[PDB]
PDB file of C-alpha atoms in Angstrom:
ATOM      1  CA  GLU A   1      -5.843  -4.383  26.518  1.00 11.57           C
ATOM      2  CA  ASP A   2      -6.715  -0.535  27.168  1.00 11.67           C
ATOM      3  CA  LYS A   3      -3.404   0.429  27.266  1.00  9.72           C
ATOM      4  CA  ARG A   4      -1.733  -1.402  24.618  1.00 10.83           C
ATOM      5  CA  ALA A   5      -4.048  -0.232  22.335  1.00  9.46           C
ATOM      6  CA  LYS A   6      -2.693   3.215  22.840  1.00  9.28           C
ATOM      7  CA  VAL A   7       0.381   2.029  22.609  1.00  7.95           C
ATOM      8  CA  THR A   8       0.532   0.662  19.110  1.00  8.08           C
ATOM      9  CA  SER A   9      -1.735   3.451  18.571  1.00 10.50           C
ATOM     10  CA  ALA A  10       0.995   6.009  19.273  1.00  8.16           C
ATOM     11  CA  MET A  11       3.476   3.289  17.380  1.00 11.28           C
ATOM     12  CA  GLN A  12       1.297   3.892  14.060  1.00 10.44           C
ATOM     13  CA  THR A  13       0.286   7.481  14.582  1.00 12.22           C
ATOM     14  CA  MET A  14       4.221   8.018  14.910  1.00 12.54           C
ATOM     15  CA  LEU A  15       5.063   6.151  11.649  1.00 13.49           C
ATOM     16  CA  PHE A  16       3.043   7.898   9.211  1.00 12.94           C
ATOM     17  CA  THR A  17       4.917  11.038  10.778  1.00 12.43           C
ATOM     18  CA  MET A  18       8.283   8.921   9.930  1.00 11.89           C
ATOM     19  CA  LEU A  19       6.782   8.511   6.493  1.00 12.75           C
ATOM     20  CA  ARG A  20       5.284  11.921   5.693  1.00 10.20           C
ATOM     21  CA  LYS A  21       9.023  13.345   7.103  1.00  9.00           C
ATOM     22  CA  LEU A  22      10.474  10.776   4.276  1.00  9.67           C
ATOM     23  CA  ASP A  23       8.823  12.507   1.763  1.00  9.66           C
ATOM     24  CA  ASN A  24       9.200   9.993  -0.653  1.00 13.27           C
ATOM     25  CA  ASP A  25       6.640   9.465  -4.405  1.00 14.84           C
ATOM     26  CA  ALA A  26       6.631   6.457  -4.521  1.00 10.56           C
ATOM     27  CA  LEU A  27       5.290   5.719  -1.035  1.00 10.81           C
ATOM     28  CA  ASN A  28       2.830   8.954  -1.002  1.00 10.19           C
ATOM     29  CA  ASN A  29       1.294   7.273  -4.367  1.00  9.48           C
ATOM     30  CA  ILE A  30       0.367   3.614  -2.128  1.00 10.82           C
ATOM     31  CA  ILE A  31      -0.310   6.159   0.791  1.00 12.29           C
ATOM     32  CA  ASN A  32      -3.057   8.352  -0.880  1.00 10.98           C
ATOM     33  CA  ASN A  33      -4.136   5.947  -3.018  1.00 14.00           C
ATOM     34  CA  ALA A  34      -5.018   3.586  -0.224  1.00 17.83           C
ATOM     35  CA  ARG A  35      -6.834   6.457   1.459  1.00 19.15           C
ATOM     36  CA  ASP A  36      -9.451   6.151  -1.537  1.00 16.92           C
ATOM     37  CA  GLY A  37      -9.908   2.629  -0.829  1.00 19.29           C
ATOM     38  CA  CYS A  38      -7.555   1.754  -3.481  1.00 20.98           C
ATOM     39  CA  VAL A  39      -5.327  -1.006  -1.744  1.00 20.59           C
ATOM     40  CA  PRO A  40      -3.368  -3.787  -2.978  1.00 20.30           C
ATOM     41  CA  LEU A  41      -4.228  -7.187  -2.298  1.00 24.77           C
ATOM     42  CA  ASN A  42      -1.105  -8.297  -2.171  1.00 22.98           C
ATOM     43  CA  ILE A  43       2.708  -7.825  -1.507  1.00 21.59           C
ATOM     44  CA  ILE A  44       3.700  -4.917  -4.114  1.00 18.24           C
ATOM     45  CA  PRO A  45       6.273  -7.236  -5.910  1.00 21.22           C
ATOM     46  CA  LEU A  46       9.481  -5.363  -6.928  1.00 22.24           C
ATOM     47  CA  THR A  47      10.188  -7.756 -10.071  1.00 24.24           C
ATOM     48  CA  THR A  48       8.812  -7.477 -13.211  1.00 24.75           C
ATOM     49  CA  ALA A  49       6.457 -10.554 -14.122  1.00 27.26           C
ATOM     50  CA  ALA A  50       5.681 -11.687 -10.579  1.00 28.77           C
ATOM     51  CA  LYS A  51       1.855 -10.293 -10.577  1.00 31.10           C
ATOM     52  CA  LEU A  52       0.311  -6.949  -8.268  1.00 27.01           C
ATOM     53  CA  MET A  53      -3.258  -7.001  -7.384  1.00 26.90           C
ATOM     54  CA  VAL A  54      -5.495  -3.750  -5.970  1.00 27.64           C
ATOM     55  CA  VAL A  55      -8.753  -3.044  -5.763  1.00 26.93           C
ATOM     56  CA  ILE A  56     -10.620   0.170  -7.721  1.00 29.95           C
ATOM     57  CA  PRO A  57     -13.587   1.442  -6.001  1.00 31.70           C
ATOM     58  CA  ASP A  58     -14.290   4.489  -8.078  1.00 35.54           C
ATOM     59  CA  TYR A  59     -14.273   5.095 -11.857  1.00 34.26           C
ATOM     60  CA  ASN A  60     -12.575   8.447 -10.689  1.00 32.15           C
ATOM     61  CA  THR A  61      -9.814   5.968  -9.140  1.00 32.01           C
ATOM     62  CA  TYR A  62      -9.895   4.109 -12.027  1.00 31.73           C
ATOM     63  CA  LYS A  63      -9.430   7.257 -14.588  1.00 32.87           C
ATOM     64  CA  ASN A  64      -6.565   8.546 -12.212  1.00 35.35           C
ATOM     65  CA  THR A  65      -4.922   5.703 -12.344  1.00 36.98           C
ATOM     66  CA  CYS A  66      -5.324   3.600 -15.645  1.00 33.81           C
ATOM     67  CA  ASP A  67      -5.170   4.562 -19.289  1.00 32.19           C
ATOM     68  CA  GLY A  68      -5.261   2.227 -22.128  1.00 32.67           C
ATOM     69  CA  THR A  69      -3.812  -0.881 -20.652  1.00 32.22           C
ATOM     70  CA  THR A  70      -0.970   0.844 -18.394  1.00 32.87           C
ATOM     71  CA  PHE A  71      -1.686   1.129 -14.783  1.00 30.06           C
ATOM     72  CA  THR A  72       0.445   3.651 -12.764  1.00 29.31           C
ATOM     73  CA  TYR A  73       0.927   2.580  -9.517  1.00 29.56           C
ATOM     74  CA  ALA A  74       4.101   3.009  -6.902  1.00 26.52           C
ATOM     75  CA  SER A  75       5.941   5.404  -8.973  1.00 25.76           C
ATOM     76  CA  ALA A  76       6.456   2.097 -11.831  1.00 25.39           C
ATOM     77  CA  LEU A  77       4.530   1.316 -14.619  1.00 24.85           C
ATOM     78  CA  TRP A  78       2.169  -1.777 -14.551  1.00 22.68           C
ATOM     79  CA  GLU A  79       0.522  -3.675 -17.596  1.00 22.22           C
ATOM     80  CA  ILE A  80      -2.973  -4.263 -16.870  1.00 19.56           C
ATOM     81  CA  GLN A  81      -3.658  -8.373 -17.750  1.00 24.01           C
ATOM     82  CA  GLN A  82      -7.654  -8.685 -16.308  1.00 24.97           C
ATOM     83  CA  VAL A  83     -10.055  -6.723 -15.059  1.00 25.36           C
ATOM     84  CA  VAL A  84     -12.861  -8.268 -12.735  1.00 27.01           C
ATOM     85  CA  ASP A  85     -15.896  -7.075 -11.475  1.00 24.69           C
ATOM     86  CA  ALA A  86     -16.978  -7.551  -7.412  1.00 26.30           C
ATOM     87  CA  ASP A  87     -18.928 -10.823  -8.745  1.00 22.96           C
ATOM     88  CA  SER A  88     -15.812 -12.256  -9.403  1.00 22.55           C
ATOM     89  CA  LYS A  89     -16.895 -11.881 -13.506  1.00 25.12           C
ATOM     90  CA  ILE A  90     -14.140 -10.725 -16.054  1.00 25.66           C
ATOM     91  CA  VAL A  91     -14.731  -7.006 -16.985  1.00 26.01           C
ATOM     92  CA  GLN A  92     -13.273  -5.719 -20.771  1.00 26.19           C
ATOM     93  CA  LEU A  93     -11.001  -2.686 -20.478  1.00 28.57           C
ATOM     94  CA  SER A  94     -13.815  -1.339 -22.658  1.00 28.63           C
ATOM     95  CA  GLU A  95     -16.536  -1.480 -20.443  1.00 26.47           C
ATOM     96  CA  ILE A  96     -14.774   0.284 -17.822  1.00 28.62           C
ATOM     97  CA  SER A  97     -15.942   3.678 -19.891  1.00 28.70           C
ATOM     98  CA  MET A  98     -17.796   6.851 -20.082  1.00 28.14           C
ATOM     99  CA  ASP A  99     -21.111   5.983 -20.298  1.00 25.75           C
ATOM    100  CA  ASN A 100     -21.274   2.828 -18.734  1.00 23.71           C
ATOM    101  CA  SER A 101     -19.290   2.987 -15.647  1.00 22.83           C
ATOM    102  CA  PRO A 102     -22.700   2.980 -13.534  1.00 24.73           C
ATOM    103  CA  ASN A 103     -23.571  -0.074 -14.860  1.00 25.20           C
ATOM    104  CA  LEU A 104     -20.242  -1.873 -13.649  1.00 18.63           C
ATOM    105  CA  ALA A 105     -19.989  -3.816  -9.929  1.00 18.69           C
ATOM    106  CA  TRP A 106     -17.781  -1.816  -8.357  1.00 18.07           C
ATOM    107  CA  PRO A 107     -15.311  -2.398  -6.566  1.00 19.25           C
ATOM    108  CA  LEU A 108     -12.817  -3.666  -9.576  1.00 18.25           C
ATOM    109  CA  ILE A 109      -9.638  -5.820  -9.280  1.00 21.25           C
ATOM    110  CA  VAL A 110      -7.013  -4.939 -11.278  1.00 20.70           C
ATOM    111  CA  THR A 111      -4.231  -7.669 -11.931  1.00 23.48           C
ATOM    112  CA  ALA A 112      -1.506  -6.001 -13.259  1.00 24.66           C
ATOM    113  CA  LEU A 113       2.655  -6.900 -13.885  1.00 26.43           C
ATOM    114  CA  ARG A 114       5.444  -4.877 -13.689  1.00 27.23           C
ATOM    115  CA  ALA A 115       6.956  -3.490 -17.149  1.00 25.40           C
TER     116      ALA A 115
ATOM    117  CA  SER B   1      21.453  10.706   4.479  1.00 23.58           C
ATOM    118  CA  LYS B   2      17.683  10.248   4.452  1.00 23.93           C
ATOM    119  CA  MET B   3      19.005   6.247   4.221  1.00 21.53           C
ATOM    120  CA  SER B   4      19.424   6.545   7.785  1.00 21.72           C
ATOM    121  CA  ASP B   5      15.794   7.326   7.864  1.00 22.14           C
ATOM    122  CA  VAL B   6      14.323   4.961   5.590  1.00 22.86           C
ATOM    123  CA  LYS B   7      15.745   2.292   7.716  1.00 21.25           C
ATOM    124  CA  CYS B   8      14.829   3.877  11.216  1.00 21.39           C
ATOM    125  CA  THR B   9      10.981   3.785   9.385  1.00 23.01           C
ATOM    126  CA  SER B  10      11.548   0.277   8.340  1.00 23.80           C
ATOM    127  CA  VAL B  11      12.329  -0.895  11.853  1.00 21.64           C
ATOM    128  CA  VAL B  12       9.142   0.769  13.009  1.00 24.74           C
ATOM    129  CA  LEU B  13       7.249  -0.600  10.423  1.00 22.29           C
ATOM    130  CA  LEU B  14       8.102  -3.914  11.301  1.00 23.37           C
ATOM    131  CA  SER B  15       7.237  -3.446  14.789  1.00 24.46           C
ATOM    132  CA  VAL B  16       3.639  -2.241  14.156  1.00 24.19           C
ATOM    133  CA  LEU B  17       3.184  -5.190  11.787  1.00 24.49           C
ATOM    134  CA  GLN B  18       4.462  -6.808  14.598  1.00 25.17           C
ATOM    135  CA  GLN B  19       2.171  -5.525  16.963  1.00 22.51           C
ATOM    136  CA  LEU B  20      -0.957  -6.198  14.687  1.00 26.27           C
ATOM    137  CA  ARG B  21       0.538  -9.842  15.361  1.00 25.71           C
ATOM    138  CA  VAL B  22       1.583 -11.188  12.180  1.00 29.23           C
ATOM    139  CA  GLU B  23       4.169 -13.831  12.956  1.00 26.87           C
ATOM    140  CA  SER B  24       1.010 -15.742  13.821  1.00 24.88           C
ATOM    141  CA  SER B  25       1.421 -16.073   9.556  1.00 21.68           C
ATOM    142  CA  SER B  26       4.540 -17.434   9.301  1.00 21.46           C
ATOM    143  CA  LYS B  27       4.682 -16.172   5.940  1.00 20.45           C
ATOM    144  CA  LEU B  28       3.567 -13.213   5.587  1.00 19.75           C
ATOM    145  CA  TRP B  29       6.047 -12.389   8.150  1.00 20.06           C
ATOM    146  CA  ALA B  30       8.891 -14.445   6.594  1.00 19.53           C
ATOM    147  CA  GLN B  31       8.806 -12.025   3.678  1.00 19.03           C
ATOM    148  CA  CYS B  32       8.413  -8.517   6.031  1.00 18.37           C
ATOM    149  CA  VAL B  33      11.327  -9.788   8.262  1.00 19.83           C
ATOM    150  CA  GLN B  34      13.701 -10.495   5.418  1.00 16.65           C
ATOM    151  CA  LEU B  35      12.233  -7.327   3.448  1.00 17.11           C
ATOM    152  CA  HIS B  36      12.695  -5.670   6.473  1.00 17.50           C
ATOM    153  CA  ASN B  37      16.544  -7.364   6.656  1.00 19.08           C
ATOM    154  CA  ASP B  38      17.150  -6.294   2.389  1.00 19.83           C
ATOM    155  CA  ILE B  39      16.832  -2.314   3.287  1.00 19.21           C
ATOM    156  CA  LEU B  40      18.489  -2.342   6.462  1.00 17.19           C
ATOM    157  CA  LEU B  41      21.218  -3.854   4.180  1.00 16.06           C
ATOM    158  CA  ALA B  42      20.816  -1.370   1.471  1.00 15.16           C
ATOM    159  CA  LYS B  43      23.679   0.647  -0.028  1.00 15.30           C
ATOM    160  CA  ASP B  44      22.053   3.150  -1.963  1.00 12.40           C
ATOM    161  CA  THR B  45      18.907   4.810  -1.440  1.00 13.09           C
ATOM    162  CA  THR B  46      17.153   3.408  -4.402  1.00  9.79           C
ATOM    163  CA  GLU B  47      16.955  -0.326  -3.429  1.00  4.99           C
ATOM    164  CA  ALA B  48      15.915   0.502  -0.207  1.00  6.89           C
ATOM    165  CA  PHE B  49      13.145   2.843  -0.984  1.00  8.89           C
ATOM    166  CA  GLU B  50      11.897   0.024  -3.187  1.00 11.49           C
ATOM    167  CA  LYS B  51      12.369  -2.117  -0.298  1.00  7.92           C
ATOM    168  CA  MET B  52      10.360  -0.439   2.037  1.00  6.33           C
ATOM    169  CA  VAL B  53       7.559   0.305  -0.791  1.00  4.52           C
ATOM    170  CA  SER B  54       7.010  -3.479  -0.925  1.00  4.90           C
ATOM    171  CA  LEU B  55       7.040  -3.721   3.007  1.00  5.84           C
ATOM    172  CA  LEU B  56       4.444  -1.007   3.558  1.00  3.29           C
ATOM    173  CA  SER B  57       2.549  -2.918   0.947  1.00  5.89           C
ATOM    174  CA  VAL B  58       1.423  -5.287   3.344  1.00  5.16           C
ATOM    175  CA  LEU B  59       0.204  -2.985   6.186  1.00  3.50           C
ATOM    176  CA  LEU B  60      -2.215  -1.404   3.787  1.00  2.00           C
ATOM    177  CA  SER B  61      -2.908  -4.880   2.177  1.00  2.00           C
ATOM    178  CA  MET B  62      -4.432  -5.567   5.841  1.00  2.00           C
ATOM    179  CA  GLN B  63      -8.175  -4.761   6.250  1.00  2.00           C
ATOM    180  CA  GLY B  64      -9.403  -4.518   9.560  1.00  2.00           C
ATOM    181  CA  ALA B  65      -5.479  -3.678  10.813  1.00  2.00           C
ATOM    182  CA  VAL B  66      -5.040   0.143  10.515  1.00  2.00           C
ATOM    183  CA  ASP B  67      -7.455   1.990   8.762  1.00  2.00           C
ATOM    184  CA  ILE B  68      -5.636   5.171   7.851  1.00  2.00           C
ATOM    185  CA  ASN B  69      -8.547   7.569   7.061  1.00  2.00           C
ATOM    186  CA  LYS B  70      -9.179   6.726  10.883  1.00  2.00           C
ATOM    187  CA  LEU B  71      -5.678   7.417  11.456  1.00  2.00           C
ATOM    188  CA  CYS B  72      -5.292  10.890   9.391  1.00  2.00           C
ATOM    189  CA  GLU B  73      -8.396  11.709  11.551  1.00  2.00           C
ATOM    190  CA  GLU B  74      -6.775  12.126  14.692  1.00  2.00           C
ATOM    191  CA  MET B  75      -3.533  13.188  12.417  1.00  2.00           C
ATOM    192  CA  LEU B  76      -5.352  16.682  12.045  1.00  2.00           C
ATOM    193  CA  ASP B  77      -7.426  17.157  15.617  1.00  2.00           C
ATOM    194  CA  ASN B  78      -3.733  16.626  16.858  1.00  2.00           C
ATOM    195  CA  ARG B  79      -1.799  18.793  14.558  1.00  2.00           C
ATOM    196  CA  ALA B  80       0.574  20.524  17.327  1.00  2.00           C
ATOM    197  CA  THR B  81       0.582  16.413  18.906  1.00  2.00           C
TER     198      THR B  81
END
């Protein structure tokens, strides 16, 4: 297992180098985002009414990515359908707030749709 | 162009998912494969890059699998290589 791990290690290392060098806004979005703990729960869908799900750990992340009902992700625009807290319980856009953010159950989950 | 490169990266991405044992989820792999065939076939860089963002998302959606932060750790300790 040890030797094959380092294979997979080299292969994964080398992949993000292929990725970095490609330097493309949409990927870099989702790689950088992923680094903050902001990851997709399912396949990013290409279409328009297929649903997207992602985790938002931070109120920062929320601020950087959400703004009213729009969700900026993967170099395209998304329509925040619903948000739920860690407890699987619904959160209204207006509780994800200045002042209230520290009373919420991070991380949250945005189900958005493509524009 | 770099349409050459997005296609190479995509071949390597599939192979990474491979080595993290995705074929034992006959449907995630189905999606991956198709996402992979789609872009090798792409005739303009856009479609390609778009199907490539979806393919990568599968990686990034896998929990234990890759920790990018730990990856980027070694990325910077071996800046030569």
